[PDB]
Structure formats: structure tokens, C-alpha cells
Design a protein around this nucleic acid. Structure first.
Ligand SMILES: [Mg+2]
Ligand SMILES: [Mg+2]
Ligand SMILES: [Mg+2]
Ligand SMILES: [Mg+2]
Ligand SMILES: [Mg+2]
Ligand SMILES: [Mg+2]
Ligand SMILES: [Mg+2]
Ligand SMILES: [Mg+2]
Ligand SMILES: [Mg+2]
Ligand SMILES: [Zn+2]
Lengths: 97, 220, 135, 99, 86
RNA sequence: UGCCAGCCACCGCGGUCAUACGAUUAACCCAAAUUAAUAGAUCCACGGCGUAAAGAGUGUUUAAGAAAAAAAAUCACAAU
């Protein structure tokens, strides 16, 4: 008959889960800008998770999208398109030190 | 000689004989932070029956059980001091080292707070001397050593047929300890509280011994 | 001499039995003291197995309804202006005030969360506490 | 008489909830050259560095204001059975006890 | 016990043996209490509790240890590895 | 005597100080029997299968079994 005993509720303080920059966006092969954000400017390589920082789902999606856009003739493979050079940098890599 | 058997037999027939009940309470302990344990990731498996629960990852020791245990522990400790036997305070923690050495010096009791030499309890005659007496009780304010393994003296006092009282935190192993008192060994007010408590139990025991001795001498 | 097996049983078990067999001819002090007031559990050796499979521990997490409120308070206003004193036994924080106000407006029968929350915020503003909130 | 549950429910540590980003009052019980060992009253002391602004105002017994990050600094590491306790708390020293 | 000399090892082993002593409960001070079977490592000992007249039918080592304990009536079969220490 | 001559059920013995060969002294043990050889009696797994003998390269069904108490078939990604 003690009313000071704890209640078996789930954690109220529990934070929301953090989100990929793209959580509930739509990656489309047709838009070369968003894609070329995740590409190395000098090489044309695709950055990995440790760099882009995405849910597995969206890293996959970006990748497949990039490949498709590359062979369909939308986006260049061997460099980032100069036009998109000065777009926001979301990636964590620093070349010049 | 018969009345010496009287002076030894008398105190065992009362539950409270040194009246230690009044030295602390559940509130007293609670204000010393004693109920506080480590993270749940650090929990030792044998410590779970002593846990009231886990509040947001921190382990909360049940202080009802802590009081129930500490009662018996202090009871034993005083009874040992009364019957004139050696009490050793063992902790390897360097914060409270000085405090503990001080405490034991002031109870007229012995303290090993330093690096514990390997064969100390097991091989007594070589380390200490030709023939020796060994502590009839050992008190552990910290049941671990600074590498976070159980203090050897636990296993070796067990080995030696010596009873052991110790403060076993949320991550310590109670198994081989005779009178474990579940509680916080890390924070200063808790350590100080226990230092004081055992100090007082010792001192009271020795005094009652003196007085019942005086009464014994006036009996004839 | 004695029994140096730690794993066999309790110190009490071994000592009592060693006496019983006539090996140990002198009864120690701590034996009689033990006899009078035995510990809660027999201090027998036990091995700390790691837990496998589905098995988990029995430890209960500690939660009260007050928490269910404190979460909302902290979500809106964050930690209070009064900081915290963990030294003061009877210290009540800004959140605890909010909790009691909310509990009292709950006894008036308001089942809507918005009403209770905003009016406990007003009942606190009345006493002179400043809630700066957060964005 | 007060049941232990009763005390625990209402204690200042229970009232705080999650210890992340909490404004707390704490006391300096020890000092090494730049290191201020600060008991904020939870379990473990934290350890802060002596700021450049009013450096000598921080002494044994001084009271200060902290932002609590972690109650106990702990993590599990590769191939270990239990976590690894640093035996400290994590805090930010803000200023000293404006009064 | 272990030494370069046989004599030394004998001494060491005696004096060390006194320190590890077991109390073995004896039903009616001749047999054991109940049937035992144990697998210790790769060894299997199986001991059955006999009546009063049936003396010590056992592996010779076990008969020895039994005469030292004071167990006067037993049956024990050992299977698997007969390695002495185990 | 000296890796010779020889011996042994298994381990093994003999290279100049052989309790192991050959003989002597002593002893042990069976005994009107005693050894050797050969057949039996007895003796394998109700044990095992990562490294030791051993989970058969894969899946499905047949025969044959088990069902012994509580539920389920189903969604990013490089099957074919
Ligand atoms: Mg600890
Ligand atoms: Mg021959
Ligand atoms: Mg010769
Ligand atoms: Mg022969
Ligand atoms: Mg011959
Ligand atoms: Mg076989
Ligand atoms: Mg094989
Ligand atoms: Mg296979
Ligand atoms: Mg094959
Ligand atoms: Zn996402």
C-alpha cells in the first residue's frame, strides 16, 4: 500500500532519434546538384558514410542515383561539374590544410 | 575464571548490547549519498538483489537492506572489539587513505591502506615475524584495488578463516565477504560516515569492556 | 592446521566442521560472535557467470508520473533559473514547483494537457518565477 | 517514519531527471595548480580548469556554477565484459556562485 | 608438492596437505549418505552406498583415501581418464 | 660373457661393475604337478562427430517417424 513506489512507464525523457540530412526527402537521378554535393570535386569519387553522414538507406539511394545519372548522361563521372563547385558543402572532408 | 566466562557470555544474550541502533538511520545514510551506485553498464551480477532499482542509468542501492546489513556489521565489529581482538581496516583507494589510517589509529585499531604485499595473510611468519597474531576481523571500506579487481585480502582472509566486513558498492563482489554492507564507497560523505560509524562501535565496545571489568573487580 | 579452500563453503562451515572433527582444538572468538548474530546470507563462494541468450536482469527502472510532467517542463523551458543545490536535502527546484502546480490543477478535474500546462505556467508566473522558455 | 522510497522520490537528484545540460551549484574541496576538484554533490567529483578571469578568486571552500553534462563518465570498449569507469563526472565550469 | 629431491617433495606435500582439509560427512560413520556420480573434467566417478558388511570395493587410490577418511564400506567405479590428480 | 652369445607377454636387456644373457648362492610362488603353445570364456558405442576417427557440396519429396504446452506465412540493398 505504498504510493511512493516507481511506475513501470516507458522513458519520458527519451530524446528523438537523430536524422540523415535526407530523412524523408526524395533523391532523384534527374537532379545533378544534390547528387554532386556528395562527390569529391577533384576525382569524381563517391564519399562514404563516415564522410556524408547518412542513414544506410540514403547512402544507398544517393549511390544508385549517382550511377544512374552518370550512365544516362546527366552527370559527369571524372570530376564534379564546375557549376556546382560553390554550392553548400555538407561533407566532412578537408583537402586543403 | 568462571566469572571471566561470565564476562564473555553476558553480552551475547542481548540483541542491542552496545546500543548501536541510535548511531544512524535510513535518513542519516540517505543524506550521506550511500544509496548511490555506478552506471548500469558497470553493475556486478551479484549486486542485483541489493538494488532498489536503476534511475536513468544510475544504480540506486536499496537503503532498507543497507540499514538491515550495517546493523549486523556494526554489531559484529563491536562484539569483536569487546572480546579483545585485532581489527584491520583495509582499503586501497587513494583519497581516503589518510582519513582511514587516522580513523584506525584513533580506535586503537590497525590499518593497511597501502600496497598489499603478496604473502601477507597467507604466509604470515615470513613477512611479519617468527610467530604472530592475525586480525580476528578485517574491514573493507573499498573492496577493490586501483586496477578495479577485487582486493586480494578478501580471497586471502577467506582462505585464512577470518570474518570480513566490507562496504560493497554497485560494481563490487559480495560473495566471499562475511558481513557485506551494500552502499556507496566513492563519495566522501559516505566513506566518512562509515569511518565514523565503525570508529564509534569500536570505542563503545572497548569502553563497555573496561566498565564490566571494573564491575568484575568490585564483585570480589 | 586450518582449511585454505575458499571455494568449498563458508568460513563458518569449514571452521565448525574442522572443530567437529577434532582437528581444530581451539574455538575462535568470531565463531561464537557469529553463532549469536549470523549474517543475512551464507558467504559461500559463487562464480560470476556471464549471462547468455534471452536472459536479462530483473532490475526495475525508476519512474514516477511527476517525471512524465518534468519531461514536458524541460522540453519547453529547459533547466530552471534557480540552478540546483544537491547539498540542500529539502531543496525544491523550479520544475518541482511546476509539478505541484500541475498536480493541484489536475485535482480540479482538467483533463486537457494544454490547459493544465499553460495555467500551471501562469500559476508559477504569479509567484514571481520567470520562465524564459526556449525556441 | 519515512520509507526509503518516500525519500528517494522527493530528493533533489530525483527532481533533476536527466543530468545533461543541467545548471548545478558545486563546491571546490581540492586544488592542484590549474585543477579545481569540485564536489557538486551527486556522486563523483568533477575536475575543471581554473579560468583566466579572476583566477585567484577560486580557493578551497569556494562555491561555483556548473553545467552538468554527465553524472559519471563511462563507456564500454572492444572486448570488455563491463564498462570502464573514469571515477569522475563531466561538467563545464561557468562562473562562480553569483550572489 | 614438487622438488629436485624426492625426500624434499615428500615433506612439502605433507605439510602443504594439512592446510587443505575437507570434512566428509559419514552416514553411520562407515558409508556415505547417498549414491554419488560426478564427472570431473574427463574423469567419471560413480559411488554407491553399501550396507555394513561390504568392505571398500574400489579403485585402489580411492580405497586409500577412504581408509584415511574413515569410510569403511563403499563401491566406486571410475571411467574415462584415470589420471590420479583429477 | 662384452651390441658377441643370447633374452622378452608389453616396456625393453647385452658396447667391460649385466639384480634382464649363461652358470652359481640365496629367495619367491605354485605343487603331483609346473611351464609353453593354441583355442575359448570375458571384452567395442545408451560413447562420440570445431581442432583428435566422424555433420556426408546443396535443396525437395518417398518410405519411415516426430507432432508431445504457446504463437507464426510477407517487404531499402549485390538471387536467378
Ligand atoms: Mg565503487
Ligand atoms: Mg630366461
Ligand atoms: Mg659381470
Ligand atoms: Mg623379468
Ligand atoms: Mg639369468
Ligand atoms: Mg571408443
Ligand atoms: Mg577430422
Ligand atoms: Mg556443411
Ligand atoms: Mg567431398
Ligand atoms: Zn534517414
Amino acid at each position: 500500500s505504498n504510493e511512493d513506489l516507481p511506475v513501470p512507464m516507458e522513458n519520458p525523457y527519451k530524446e528523438p532519434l537523430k536524422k540523415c540530412i535526407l530523412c524523408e526527402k526524395h533523391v532523384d537521378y534527374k537532379n545533378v546538384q544534390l547528387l554532386s554535393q556528395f562527390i569529391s570535386p577533384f576525382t569524381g569519387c563517391i564519399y562514404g558514410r563516415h564522410i556524408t553522414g547518412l542513414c544506410g538507406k540514403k547512402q544507398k539511394e544517393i549511390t544508385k542515383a549517382i550511377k544512374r545519372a552518370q550512365i544516362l548522361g546527366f552527370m559527369p563521372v571524372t570530376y564534379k561539374d564546375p557549376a556546382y563547385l560553390k554550392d553548400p558543402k555538407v561533407c566532412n572532408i578537408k583537402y586543403r590544410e | 575464571n568462571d566469572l571471566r566466562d561470565r564476562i564473555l557470555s553476558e553480552p551475547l544474550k542481548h540483541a542491542d548490547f552496545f546500543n548501536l541502533k541510535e548511531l544512524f538511520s535510513v535518513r542519516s545514510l540517505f543524506d550521506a549519498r550511500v544509496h548511490l551506485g555506478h552506471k548500469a553498464g558497470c553493475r556486478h551480477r551479484f549486486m542485483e538483489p541489493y538494488l532498489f532499482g536503476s534511475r536513468l542509468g544510475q544504480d540506486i542501492i536499496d537503503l532498507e537492506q543497507t540499514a538491515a546489513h550495517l546493523q549486523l556489521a556494526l554489531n559484529f565489529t563491536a562484539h569483536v572489539a569487546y572480546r579483545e581482538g585485532i581489527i584491520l581496516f583495509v582499503s586501497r583507494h587513494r583519497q581516503f587513505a589518510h582519513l582511514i589510517e587516522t580513523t584506525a589509529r584513533d580506535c586503537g585499531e590497525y590499518a593497511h591502506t597501502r600496497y598489499f604485499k603478496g604473502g601477507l595473510l597467507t604466509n604470515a611468519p615470513l613477512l611479519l615475524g617468527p610467530g604472530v597474531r592475525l586480525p580476528d576481523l578485517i574491514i573493507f571500506l573499498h573492496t577493490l584495488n586501483n586496477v578495479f579487481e577485487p582486493h586480494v585480502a578478501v580471497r586471502d582472509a577467506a582462505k585464512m578463516n577470518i570474518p570480513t566486513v566490507g562496504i560493497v558498492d554497485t560494481n563490487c563482489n559480495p560473495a566471499l565477504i562475511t558481513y557485506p554492507v551494500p552502499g556507496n564507497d566513492d563519495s566522501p560523505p559516505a566513506v566518512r560516515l562509515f569511518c565514523r560509524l565503525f570508529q564509534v562501535a569500536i570505542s563503545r565496545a572497548k569502553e563497555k569492556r573496561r566498565q564490566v571489568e571494573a564491575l568484575y573487580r568490585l564483585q570480589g | 592446521a586450518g582449511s585454505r579452500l575458499e571455494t568449498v563453503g563458508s568460513i563458518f562451515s569449514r571452521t565448525r566442521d574442522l572443530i567437529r572433527a577434532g582437528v581444530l582444538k581451539e574455538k575462535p572468538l568470531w565463531l561464537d560472535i557469529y553463532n549469536a548474530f549470523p549474517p543475512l546470507r551464507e558467504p559461500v563462494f559463487r562464480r560470476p557467470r556471464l549471462r547468455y541468450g534471452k536472459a536479462k536482469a530483473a532490475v526495475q527502472d525508476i519512474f514516477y508520473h511527476e517525471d512524465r510532467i518534468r519531461a514536458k517542463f524541460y522540453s519547453a523551458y529547459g533547466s530552471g533559473p534557480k540552478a540546483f543545490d544537491l547539498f540542500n536535502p529539502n531543496f525544491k527546484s523550479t520544475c518541482q514547483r511546476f509539478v505541484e502546480k500541475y498536480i493541484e490543477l489536475q485535482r480540479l478535474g482538467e483533463t486537457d494537457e494544454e490547459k493544465l500546462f499553460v495555467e500551471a505556467g501562469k500559476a508559477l508566473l504569479a509567484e514571481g518565477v520567470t520562465l524564459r522558455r526556449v525556441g | 517514519v519515512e520509507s526509503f522510497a518516500s525519500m528517494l522520490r522527493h530528493s533533489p537528484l530525483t527532481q533533476m531527471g536527466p543530468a545533461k545540460n543541467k545548471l548545478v551549484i558545486g563546491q571546490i574541496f581540492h586544488i592542484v595548480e590549474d585543477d579545481l576538484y569540485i564536489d557538486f554533490g551527486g556522486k563523483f567529483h568533477c575536475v575543471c580548469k581554473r579560468p583566466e578571469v579572476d583566477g585567484e578568486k577560486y580557493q578551497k571552500g569556494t562555491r561555483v556554477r556548473l553545467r552538468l553534462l554527465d553524472l559519471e563518465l563511462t563507456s564500454r570498449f572492444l572486448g570488455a565484459t563491463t564498462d570502464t569507469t573514469i571515477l569522475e563526472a563531466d561538467a563545464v565550469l561557468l562562473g562562480l556562485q553569483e550572489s | 608438492g614438487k622438488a629436485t629431491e624426492r625426500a624434499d617433495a615428500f615433506r612439502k606435500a605433507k605439510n602443504r596437505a594439512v592446510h587443505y582439509l575437507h570434512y566428509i560427512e559419514r552416514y553411520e560413520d562407515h558409508t556415505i549418505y547417498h549414491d554419488i556420480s560426478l564427472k570431473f573434467k574427463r574423469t567419471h566417478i560413480k559411488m554407491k552406498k553399501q550396507p555394513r558388511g561390504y568392505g571398500l570395493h574400489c579403485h585402489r587410490a580411492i580405497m586409500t583415501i577412504c581408509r584415511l577418511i574413515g569410510i569403511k564400506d563403499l563401491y566406486a567405479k571410475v571411467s574415462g581418464s584415470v589420471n590420479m590428480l583429477n
